[PDB]
Each structure stands twice: as structure tokens, then as C-alpha cells.
Motif scaffolding. Structure first.
Motif, short mmCIF file in Angstrom:
data_model
loop_
_atom_site.label_atom_id
_atom_site.label_comp_id
_atom_site.label_asym_id
_atom_site.label_seq_id
_atom_site.Cartn_x
_atom_site.Cartn_y
_atom_site.Cartn_z
N UNK A 59 44.83 65.31 -23.51
CA UNK A 59 44.91 66.24 -22.40
C UNK A 59 46.38 66.34 -22.03
N UNK A 60 46.90 67.56 -21.98
CA UNK A 60 48.27 67.80 -21.54
C UNK A 60 49.27 66.90 -22.27
N UNK A 61 49.06 66.71 -23.56
CA UNK A 61 50.00 65.96 -24.41
C UNK A 61 50.09 64.50 -23.99
N UNK A 62 48.95 63.94 -23.60
CA UNK A 62 48.81 62.52 -23.36
C UNK A 62 47.38 62.15 -23.71
N UNK A 63 47.10 60.85 -23.68
CA UNK A 63 45.76 60.32 -23.88
C UNK A 63 45.23 59.84 -22.54
N UNK A 64 43.95 60.06 -22.30
CA UNK A 64 43.37 59.58 -21.06
C UNK A 64 41.86 59.61 -21.20
#
Ligand code: UPW
Ligand code: MN
Length: 202
Positions: A59-64
Motif C-alpha cells: 500500500x502506497x509503496x510500503x508494506x502493512x
């Protein structure tokens, strides 16, 4: 031990595997497998989906972890009974009777797919283990230590094998080497790995 804190339970899920795979197919009928894009822009060779209240995703160039599947805009499918029960049996056998995962990442490896060396540090409490269930074709799991350049060890993970990654092993760098092609009577041509995680804050 092969990895401090890890508890390897070979064939622990062998009897449950047919039902587990039925439930993978059900989950994926709602939240389909997709090849996510890493923060560096690369499409992963592994395809993933999730079940449970939370799911691991880009999501949005991150992991979560998110309660909503960004591909469907709907909640991830509920945790199947077979998943819940197998994870609890394994975690309890391994000495984590209170482990209560709220996410299960389902990872499909086609021939040639791999997971490069990484740590799983996105969870709020790294004292909670990750329970990892292998189904289908065998794969070579590599793992080192807490430092990226710690020496690597390798072990084959086969259909039905469960590993409870607790203690120090929870923080090791690890990965999966390119999957050899083959046949498995229950998965046909792939490997699935389930990783159960406690992703929500207490
Ligand atoms: O297949 C097995 O036997 C074991 N499977 C795993 O260790 C596994 N781990 C995942 N974890 C990730 C965390 C960070 C990451 N990154 O930053 O690029 C990539 C991945 C995601 C999916 C997994 O199936
Ligand atoms: Mn991992």
C-alpha cells in the motif's frame, strides 16, 4: 537446534492438507491471488492473498496490514476453521498456547518463484511467533541470523511441514529458493505456504 527458537513439526499438517487446500481455493475465490509490487518497483514472482481480520499487503509503496483487500475493496475472507485449528494445534505443541493470529498470508509459488532474503518485522509484537505451513511441492528454505550477512543454512520444507518461528528465529533473515517444477497430487504444480501472524495491536 537448527534455528534457536524455531520448532520444526514435519508432516504436522499432512492429514489436514486436503481441507486446507480446499479452504485456500475458497479464500482465493473471494480475494484472488495477486503478484504484488515491492517498494522498489519489482513484481514479486510469488502470488499472495490473505484471510483473517487483517492481511499483509503493499500500500502506497510500503508494506502493512490492512483490514481491507485493496484489490476488492472488501474485507479479506474470514479465517477458515481448518486454518484456525491447525495453527492453534501447532502453536500449542510448540509452547505458544496463547498465539491468536488475526492474519494469514497465503503464498503461492509457481515453478521458478522465489522469495529473496528478508525479515518479517511488520508485526507489532515480535515476541509472537509466526506459524508457517507448507503444502504441495517441496522448497528450499534458507535462513541466516539477525544480521543480513550471517551465515546461511538451508532446509527442505515438504508438504505438510509446519515451522513455528519463535524466539530468536522469529527475527532471522530468511527466504525461499526458486521452486523446482514437479507434480504434487493435491496442489498439482505449485507450493502454498501459509504464514499465521498476530498483526493487530493488543
Ligand atoms: O514460504 C515460506 O516457507 C516462508 N514464507 C515467508 O517467509 C513469507 N514471508 C513474507 N514476508 C515478507 C516480509 C517482507 C518482505 N519484503 O520486505 O520484501 C517480503 C516478504 C511474505 C510471504 C511469505 O510466504
Ligand atoms: Mn518471511
Amino acid at each position: 537446534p537448527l534455528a534457536a527458537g524455531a520448532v520444526i513439526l514435519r508432516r504436522f499438517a499432512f492429514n489436514a492438507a486436503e481441507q486446507l487446500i480446499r479452504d485456500i481455493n475458497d479464500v482465493a475465490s473471494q480475494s484472488p491471488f495477486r503478484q504484488m509490487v515491492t517498494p522498489g518497483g519489482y513484481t514479486m514472482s510469488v502470488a499472495m492473498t490473505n484471510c483473517g481480520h487483517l492481511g499483509w499487503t503493499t500500500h502506497r509503496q510500503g508494506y502493512l496490514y490492512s483490514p481491507i483487500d485493496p484489490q476488492t475493496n472488501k474485507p479479506w475472507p474470514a479465517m477458515p476453521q481448518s486454518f484456525h485449528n491447525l495453527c492453534q494445534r501447532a502453536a500449542t505443541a510448540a509452547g505458544y498456547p496463547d498465539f491468536q493470529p488475526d492474519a494469514c498470508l497465503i503464498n503461492r509459488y509457481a515453478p521458478g518463484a522465489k522469495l529473496s532474503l528478508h525479515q518479517d518485522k511488520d508485526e507489532p509484537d515480535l515476541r509472537a511467533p509466526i506459524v508457517s505451513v507448507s503444502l504441495g511441492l517441496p522448497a528450499i528454505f534458507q535462513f541466516g541470523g539477525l544480521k543480513r550477512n550471517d551465515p546461511l543454512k538451508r532446509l527442505l520444507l515438504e508438504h505438510g511441514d509446519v515451522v513455528v518461528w519463535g524466539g530468536e528465529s522469529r527475527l532471522f533473515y530468511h527466504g525461499i529458493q526458486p521452486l523446482k517444477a514437479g507434480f504434487h497430487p493435491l496442489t498439482i504444480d505449485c507450493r502454498y505456504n501459509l504464514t499465521f501472524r498476530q498483526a493487530g495491536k493488543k
